């Protein structure tokens, strides 16, 4: 018809419910992916050649491949094995995996970003790589890493809107729902996009503000 946002107001509980659902997805998704990523990182540091090759292949393949195709690979691709994983567990799995690769790389880069001179000083004072790592390098890598992890989350928020196509009732899914009863797509999408924007701004603000608490 024509634009009518006022008609959208009564659907506030739907948006609020969608919003809460996008949050719940992303938090848990990252939380697993970070721990996963940490682990993937540890493998790539191993002296054991096969394991290093495996972590490298994991990271390389996941980063070099679309989020969608991973999602559908978990959801659709598993059906034919008598597997019926919910929309939720599928989305979280996919995100935790994608995030695991990017988080592992954030860690490696956060370490390599610490001045090599630190390691030189430490070794030259008689410390072994282990000790140098515990007492000198890692406490600095951390301050490199927390800001990039914190940033990864903000990306995972935007990315998670892709679970709508799988039929998960996220913030984006709402626009289908609403339109089924309003025949309007435009206005609820403008509203939804606005919510993602406000969320992104908010979290960016807190993130940088925290970064100053560190650096």
């Amino acid at each position: 018809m024509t634009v009518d946002f006022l008609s959208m107001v009564k659907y506030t509980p739907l948006f609020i419910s969608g919003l809460i659902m996008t949050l719940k997805l992303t938090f848990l998704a990252v939380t697993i992916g970070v721990l996963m990523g940490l682990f993937i990182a540890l493998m790539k540091m191993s002296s054991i050649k096969p394991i290093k090759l495996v972590a490298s292949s994991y990271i390389e393949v996941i980063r070099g491949t679309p989020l969608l195709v991973q999602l559908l690979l978990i959801y659709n691709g598993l059906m034919q094995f008598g597997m019926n994983i919910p929309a939720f567990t599928a989305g979280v799995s996919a995100l935790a995996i994608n995030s695991s690769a990017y988080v592992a790389e954030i860690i490696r880069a956060g370490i390599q970003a610490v001045d090599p001179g630190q390691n030189e000083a430490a070794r030259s004072l008689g410390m072994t790589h282990a000790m140098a790592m515990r007492y000198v390098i890692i406490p600095q890598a951390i301050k490199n890493i927390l800001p990039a992890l914190g940033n990864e989350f903000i990306v995972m928020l935007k990315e998670s809107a892709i679970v709508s196509v799988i039929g998960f009732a996220d913030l984006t899914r709402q626009a289908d729902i609403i339109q089924s009863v309003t025949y309007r797509y435009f206005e609820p999408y403008i509203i939804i996009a606005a919510i993602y924007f406000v969320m992104t701004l908010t979290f960016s603000k807190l993130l940088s503000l925290f970064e100053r608490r560190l650096r």
Partner: protein, 240 residues
């Protein structure tokens, strides 16, 4: 005591050391000088294996340390190193900087380590800065701190890789003075420097390197006044 024996070093296509031999005995203050690309700092860093020779061997106290059949940490406990750019641990205070390695490597008692640290801080004139963090230290204070930290591991030789080059000119003296004080106390030292004053004042021997080779050596006055080789004269004429 230190015996670098005919070593070579490559960084890819870059030949930095092309056959270098260096012997230093206990109590010597040896000073290595030369143009950029001479190989000074590379030779300097071969001594405690911050670099690995492509060929040749380095022995300290008569035992070869680049055969992979020796504990390198144990080596570097004997061989100290002061860095051009300080390489202070930023998250650790002055005292903590000094005591980290003794406590964790030598397993020293924390009270004892603490007493050591405050003695060294007095020595390099940094007692009033004991707790602070580097960021709050000037260049001179930083290098004097780095020196204290190196000393707390009580090495038998100290390696110095251009410890003054990154200092404001008003700040060079204080660091040089501490180094001289150590020289006067009989510490074995290998120093790579631009500051010829130091070599004049406390150096026992001067090594002139050019194009990855030791081209001439002798006592400080021999080199500074009676240099035999033409390359040495060239360098000095530009430098002195």
């Amino acid at each position: 005591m230190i015996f670098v024996n005919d070593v070579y070093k490559n960084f890819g296509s870059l030949e930095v050391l092309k056959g270098v031999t260096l012997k230093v005995n206990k109590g010597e203050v040896v000073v290595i000088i030369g143009p950029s690309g001479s190989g000074k700092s590379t030779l300097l860093r071969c001594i405690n294996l911050l670099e690995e020779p492509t060929k040749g061997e380095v022995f300290i106290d008569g035992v070869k340390i680049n055969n992979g059949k020796v504990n390198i940490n144990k080596v570097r406990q004997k061989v100290g190193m002061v860095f051009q750019h300080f390489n202070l641990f930023p998250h650790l205070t002055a005292i903590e900087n000094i005591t980290l390695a003794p406590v964790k490597v030598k397993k020293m008692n924390k009270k004892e380590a603490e007493e050591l640290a405050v003695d060294l801080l007095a020595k390099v004139g940094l007692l009033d800065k004991k707790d602070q963090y580097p960021i709050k230290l000037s260049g001179g204070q930083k290098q004097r701190l780095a020196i204290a930290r190196a000393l707390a591991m009580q090495p038998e030789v100290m390696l110095f890789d251009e410890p003054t080059s990154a200092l404001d000119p008003e700040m060079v003296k204080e660091v040089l003075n501490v180094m001289k004080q150590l020289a006067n106390e009989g510490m074995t030292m290998v120093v790579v420097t631009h500051e010829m004053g130091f070599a004049r004042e406390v150096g026992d021997r001067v090594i002139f390197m050019d194009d990855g080779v030791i081209v001439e050596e002798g006592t400080p006055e021999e080199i500074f006044y009676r240099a035999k080789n033409e390359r040495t004269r060239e360098f000095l004429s530009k430098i002195l």
